[PDB]
């Protein structure tokens, strides 16, 4: 029993992190087979970020402008190319620690682990969710660009995120591993802001089920409700609307606890309209929305 | 910027986890050089736990009663011995992935990362604190015994915790790596309960500094207070008393923010006497006490 913000073990990813230096800019890269992936703004000077033309900046570089370091070993750059917002650096040595991997793009509301890195060196691991406004509420300092987010699926590392920048509000924006941004952001210094964030309703419900499984029951009630009456209240409190697919996804947790989804929705409706009244749920005084149904099952069953 | 519950990268520890089977009991072990460390209750049957005599149970075993598996490889047990509440299994092969390591015993209020494992296989990583009552609020299912807690100190893994059991209240108890329990617990099924937990005051203060660094300032005030007047209020709310050593430890955060410790204590005194009034601090509606001053510096400076 117990319930924690749990990340995937990072060992398989740690062996792929490298340092990439171009000019006076150094950040992190991901070394898989004989390719190093890193944010394309490594080729920018401190002044280039105001309004970069990456095609021009790249043609003015050659392979020897790129210093790639894997621990103490130097990797020789053999070729380079740009794919959307990522640089692909071909190197002379294939990473012998290359795990089985996939590149996947995730959806808002899904979670992943982040391996925060500096100078190519892993510093910490934490769990977060892709927000409905396509930002993540990460923890990143200057130099963390190129850090990656991932899930582990049996033996296979699914890479889903590469960090590029922090927005003025203190949240974080990045790309998938094909270089395509999450959300309407660009890798240049402007006045971009994130849109309105909402609460991930299916995740809040999954977490209430985790609470019941761990013996927190004070918020349950006898009432039930319909999908339509719930969503009407959810809209008023900035909660994502709830669909029949969400209900199906929560099935395993409903089965294990004997509490129907629409019954749990009635409890959620109550907590939104009355608050928590100084009670807590799994050690929190707010409703948590960064655990998926799958996260809960993994932690409360195996 | 941002602030997360951040664990250490687990790669160096993942390479040391093995599965240990004795009879029908299988749990996790830690394989360092040519020794596998695991909880001694692996030698107990489901009925032995009621009142075990470990000296008797161990003399009735031989090396071949112990099945040690490192992935697909079988490790041959060459000898065994008991050290306090841990078994030391001598094996024929030294772990080639043995990191530089130390065995250290930690103090209440200190934090560490936990690599939760099942059947010798790493499942997740999370951060927690040793509570003042010598329990940890972990997340563990049946079969997690032998999972370890650790800190990373530059290149060196400091092992500080091995998991043994869950108490009736849902919290967790274990030993250091020399087999000595944290707290007044024993590895046998009785009616042991944890004593009263208190809030780790120096950690709450460190976290308020992390909030200020990240732009949360609404709880600050002009007042100041003395060590003695604060501790009088702290006692009433079940907070650990605050000492001059704590003040010194918080120095770097006071320096970086320009807010003196005793000034921050005055803000804490206010939050205890009036509550948070529906405001949050770093995304929490409760005062968090599981980040040390060192955790904050690591995350908010580097």
From Swiss-Prot, chains A, B:
Cytoplasmic side: 1-302
Reported impact of residue 205 to V: In strain: Zeta/P.2
Gene transcribed to yield this protein: rep
Phenotype for residue 49 to A: Does not affect ability to cleave and inactivate human TRMT1
Subunit annotation: 3CL-PRO exists as monomer and homodimer. Only the homodimer shows catalytic activity. Interacts with host FBXO22; this interaction promotes the proteasomal degradation of nsp5.
Active site residues according to the UniProt entry: 41, 145
Residue span relative to the full protein: 3264 to 3565 of 7096
Catalysis performed (reactions): TSAVLQ-|-SGFRK-NH2 and SGVTFQ-|-GKFKK the two peptides corresponding to the two self-cleavage sites of the SARS 3C-like proteinase are the two most reactive peptide substrates. The enzyme exhibits a strong preference for substrates containing Gln at P1 position and Leu at P2 position
Compartment(s) where it occurs, according to its Swiss-Prot or TrEMBL record: Host cytoplasm; Host Golgi apparatus; Host nucleus
Protein's recorded name: 3C-like proteinase nsp5
Modulation of this protein's activity: Inhibited by pyridone-containing alpha-ketoamides compounds 13a and 13b. In turn, alpha-ketoamide 13b (tert-butyl (1-((S)-1-(((S)-4-(benzylamino)-3,4-dioxo-1-((S)-2-oxopyrrolidin-3-yl)butan-2-yl)amino)-3-cyclopropyl-1-oxopropan-2-yl)-2-oxo-1,2-dihydropyridin-3-yl)carbamate) inhibits SARS-CoV-2 replication in human lung cells. Inhibited ex vivo by michael acceptor inhibitor N3. Inhibited ex vivo by compound 11a and 11b.
Crosslink position(s): Glycyl lysine isopeptide (Lys-Gly) (interchain with G-Cter in ubiquitin): 5, 90
Effect of residue 189 to A: Does not affect ability to cleave and inactivate human TRMT1
Described function: Cleaves the C-terminus of replicase polyprotein at 11 sites. Recognizes substrates containing the core sequence [ILMVF]-Q-|-[SGACN]. Cleaves and inactivates human TRMT1, preventing tRNA guanine(26)-dimethylation of tRNAs. May cleave human NLRP1 in lung epithelial cells, thereby activating the NLRP1 inflammasome pathway. May cleave human GSDMD, triggering alternative GSDME-mediated epithelial cell death upon activation of the NLRP1 inflammasome, which may enhance the release interleukins 1B, 6, 16 and 18. Also able to bind an ADP-ribose-1''-phosphate (ADRP).
Effect of residue 132 to H: In strain: Omicron/BA.1, Omicron/BA.2, Omicron/BA.2.12.1, Omicron/BA.2.75, Omicron/BA.4, Omicron/BA.5, Omicron/BQ.1.1, Omicron/XBB.1.5, Omicron/EG.5.1
Effect on the protein of changing residue 142 to A: Does not affect ability to cleave and inactivate human TRMT1
Highest taxon of the lineage: Viruses
Residues in Peptidase C30 domain copies: 1-302
